[PDB]
A paper describes a structure:
The c-Src tyrosine kinase is made up of six functional regions: (i) a N-terminal fatty acid-acylation domain, (ii) a unique domain, (iii) a Src homology 3 (SH3) domain, (iv) a Src homology 2 (SH2) domain, (v) a catalytic domain, and (vi) a C-terminal regulatory domain. Of all those, the SH3 domain plays a key role in the regulation of the tyrosine kinase activity through the recognition of an intramolecular Proline Rich Motif (PRM) and, additionally, through the interaction with other PRMs present in other proteins. To better understand the mechanism of 3D-domain swapping formation in c-Src-SH3 domain, and its plausible implication in amyloid fibril formation, we have solved the crystallographic structures of the WT and three mutants at position 128 of the c-Src-SH3 domain.
The structures of the monomeric form of the WT (WTM) and Gln128Glu mutant (Q128EM) of the c-Src-SH3 domain were solved from crystals belonging to space group P212121 with two molecules in the AU. In both structures, whereas chain A could be completely modeled (amino acids 81-140), some residues at the n-Src loop of chain B could not be modeled because of the lack of electron-density in the difference maps. Residues belonging to this cloning tail participate in the binding of a Ni2+ ion through their backbone nitrogen atoms and the Nδ1 atom of His83 side-chain. In both structures, the main differences between chains A and B are located at the distal and n-Src loops. In both monomeric structures, the side-chain of residue Glu106 in chain A (Glu106A) is hydrogen-bonded to Ser123A side-chain and two water molecules, thereafter W1 and W2. However, in chain B, Glu106B side-chain is hydrogen-bonded to Thr125B side-chain (2.8 Å) instead of Ser123B side-chain (distance between Glu106B and Ser123B is 5 Å). Changes at the folding nucleation site also affect residue Leu100, which is conserved among SH3 domains, and is part of the hydrophobic core with an ASA value <10 Å2. This residue shows different rotamers at each chain: rotamer tp in chain A vs rotamer mt in chain B. The presence of the rotamer mt is allowed by the displacement of the backbone of the distal loop (distance between A and B chain backbone atoms was ∼1.5 Å) and the low steric hindrance of the nearby residue, Gly130.
Residue numbers in the entry: 81 to 140
The structure:
């Protein structure tokens, strides 16, 4: 709930307004994981927020 972050495994570039662009290695908080495929994430590394593909991250 505040104890866990995820790490980005790969680079991803969004061309949609609601997806997050991020680089591998970024530290991400998962904000909304109600859906299995796409999670709302907040990057602590960039301060940006948006949906990410769930298979692009793993728990840190
Ligand atoms: Ni927590």
């Amino acid at each position: 709930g505040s104890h866990m972050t995820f790490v980005a495994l790969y680079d991803y570039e969004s061309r949609t307004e609601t997806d997050l662009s991020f680089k591998k290695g970024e530290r991400l908080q998962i904000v909304n994981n109600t859906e299995g495929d796409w999670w709302l994430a907040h990057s602590l590394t960039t301060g940006q927020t948006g949906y990410i593909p769930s298979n692009y991250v793993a728990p840190s």
